[PDB]
Design a protein around this ligand. Structure first.
Ligand code: MTM
Ligand code: MTM
Ligand code: MTM
Lengths: 270, 270, 270
């Protein structure tokens, strides 16, 4: 049995996506999640929705409690976590409105805890060095890619997301630099969300929505980002609604088992 | 009416530059500024001088209260902020003693608050994502460039400053790496000073003074830096004294208005 | 007279290396070192062994008290510090099991104090900007290289170590990126250990042991790393045992004097 956690990003966290909704505030050893968990279903699949920045978008990327958010979803029984994230495009072929099923990331954050194993919680003892060669769940990404195709949506099958600390946008020198490093899209929230999900043994995948071209001719601004999201939000919603039932009808025993082992054996006990 | 804030860097924070001086210690919601504000004038233009590292250079780059410094200057009514900064040259053509009117930056700092919108002060509510495509005020930079020319000074019209956390200087591997990234000069103080100034809607420009060649044949050292500054400090002083009156005689209504809007609309309210 | 401090890394901190051992717990102005200092000798040379992650490997790289460790060794009278460190290879020619006598580093850490001069301890007053052009002691590295040759060990005479924050391993995008930056090996502990040693005027050198190929065909994992170390640990032990007596029989007056001056003159007093 699967349970899909859904973390909604900027202008992409609509609760109306789930049926039979029930609000549930929880606490974790790492503090409170961004907002209440929204329990519900898409067809016959159990889901748990969570607004990354709070339902009123009051939490900046740097201060999102990534540990609490992932912990709460795991505790609720989530086997999978599919998220949405607005991002800047660093490639001409990735136009605003396009969806990018990212498969890699480049960390540029500097003040964020990236592990549950900080030796402050008995629930997570030891030193954990989680592998990051393949940060995102390939099976889920495959379904997302095929579903986007079935929906006729402009979608990119791979992409490297560079995550900056923020809250400021990048300078032009940084923008051009990230391009040389191989980054394809840019945001402020992928890391450490994807890292903690890995440590928790959860299949994590991300629906990245290009909302601008950053500044590498109209430079990025908050208004430009919100406008693009307003015009394209429906795509991510349709993708999630169509993808989730497919996930709930496939086999994951071996996939989840492997993630469990990788996470477990990454821990160095005293 | 304009009011020019001046932040003086290493060996480039001489109070004698202003006439009719009055010392004024202030406090801000983010703590105390590096030192007392020095109120004064250059010709008929009101200025406010502040020593970035304290008048006795007792504050390391990592611990400079950038938020308090910019906040205090804004509160005092500064419309512009022109600063001086010693830096290492990462380009053969930028010789020690040369002035570089930087137009871009590459952030390498890791433990510095870069925004006033940290949700801890009612005076700055919400999440602010300030644009950084053009970090420095083009109009002020233009006057600085033309003034340096009128003064016959070796001056570079553009440059990318990479700001490292410090207090240690860079290794040779890092030095060579920054060159490949497109950095032209290197220091430990541009970021987040320029970022916070932007959020405050202030026209910010920086007079960068090359004091060494870092280590990419004599490698950089504190003594080498202080010596070069001692020999070239007069240039930055003359540039400021000559530039400021010109700024006070030009039009800024539209320029300041645009910066005000950009800063304002960058904030996401609940 | 010399005294060699030895910091042992993952699976490379065996106390049996020293004769006439005596355990000594100490405290420093920056807190307690990772574990008790192990006083002893190799032939007629005084040594002080310290397990970087604690004798039971309970301290993650991000939380190792680098300041306390280096301070304790200096206080004990160490003139030299030779360490061992497991690392990932970013170059085809550097095979697991190979030793790399690194000469440069690229910092990718973000939450680590890198200086003793944080203005919180009277023992270290002022602002210190220590040079990092040559982070490692060339004389010690030379002896290590010649000794490895005499021992018939596969050893690389130079190498750039990129130190990531961790505890997570790098993504593939980051791995490939570090290669383009010029990094040859990768770990989570070189920085700021080498930086603080420099500020303390200690001759620091590092015996890096490649334990994997990171993920740029079997990707890195904790088990793979521990296995390689188990099979190759003896090499580092033999290298240390053979190198140290040679260090104790050579001249260091001028070398230590120069490091003393560089460290001293890097400090800016009020
Ligand atoms: C309201 S725009 C800032 C948010 N949207 C994402 C974003 C969109 N476009 C860009 C973002 N982040 C960085 N650079 C960009 N060009 C980031 O993750 C923030 O949470
Ligand atoms: C006393 S030299 C260190 C200061 N001067 C600036 C500097 C000069 N030259 C270099 C600096 N910073 C980094 N690398 C360099 N090569 C930095 O911003 C520090 O505040
Ligand atoms: C138990 S493997 C993690 C530790 N070993 C070192 C290491 C070995 N191999 C790699 C390490 N660190 C980063 N990337 C790598 N491929 C790091 O410094 C950690 O202390």
């Amino acid at each position: 049995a699967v349970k899909i956690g859904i973390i909604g990003g900027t202008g992409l966290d609509d609760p109306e996506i789930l049926e039979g909704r029930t609000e549930k505030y929880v606490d974790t050893p790492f503090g409170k999640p961004s907002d209440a968990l929204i329990l519900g279903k898409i067809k016959n699949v159990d889901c748990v929705l969570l607004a990354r920045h709070g339902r009123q978008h009051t939490i900046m990327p740097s201060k999102v409690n990534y540990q609490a958010n992932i912990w709460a979803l795991k505790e609720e029984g989530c086997t999978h976590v599919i998220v949405t994230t607005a991002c800047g495009s660093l490639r001409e072929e990735i136009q605003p409105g396009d969806i990018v099923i990212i498969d890699q990331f480049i960390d540029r954050t500097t003040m964020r805890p990236q592990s549950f194993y900080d030796g402050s919680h008995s629930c997570a003892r030891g030193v954990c060095h989680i592998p990051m060669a393949e940060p995102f769940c390939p099976k889920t990404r495959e379904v997302l890619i095929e579903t986007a195709k079935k929906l006729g949506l402009r979608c990119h099958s791979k992409g490297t997301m560079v995550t900056i600390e923020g809250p400021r946008f990048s300078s032009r020198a940084e923008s051009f630099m990230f391009r040389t490093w191989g980054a394809d899209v840019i945001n402020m929230t992928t890391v450490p969300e994807v890292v903690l999900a890995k440590e928790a043994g959860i299949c994590y995948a991300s629906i990245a929505m290009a909302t601008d071209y950053d500044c590498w001719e109209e430079a990025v601004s908050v208004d430009r980002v919100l406008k693009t999201l307003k015009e394209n939000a429906n795509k991510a919603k349709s993708l999630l609604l169509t993808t989730i039932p497919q996930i709930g009808s496939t086999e994951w025993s071996e996939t989840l088992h492997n993630l469990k082992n990788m996470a477990q054996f990454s821990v160095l006990l005293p």
